[PDB]
Design a protein around this nucleic acid. Structure first.
Length: 70
RNA sequence: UUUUUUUUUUUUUUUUUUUUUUUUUUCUCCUCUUUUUUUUUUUU
């Protein structure tokens, strides 16, 4: 995300401007990330706090390079 | 009518000890051919 510029956020091949998967938390790894984050969002938009951190910049970039490799 | 004598199975028992798997060679060695390397996408 905000580790890069807007121009690097698009999904030109499909004419979208943002595209990921969320339909497979089981056979992949970015999807469990997306699960944790979406559920953190539905649980945080109540004005409380989600104890226990989620990620950090370097962690996310090493995970995404690992997933590209795999 | 034929008496008397010529030994036998070596003696001994009431001595201390503080190590340790194995064990000892063999040299340098020409990998052949459409490629940059493909890549989104969706159904597990």
């Amino acid at each position: 995300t905000g580790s890069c510029a807007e121009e690097e956020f698009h999904h030109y091949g499909l004419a979208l401007d943002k595209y990921t998967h969320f339909t497979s938390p089981i056979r992949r790894y970015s999807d469990i990330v997306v699960h944790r984050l979406l559920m953190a969002a539905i649980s945080k938009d109540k004005k409380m706090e989600i104890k226990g951190n989620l990620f950090s910049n370097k962690d996310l970039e090493e995970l995404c390079r690992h997933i590209n490799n795999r």
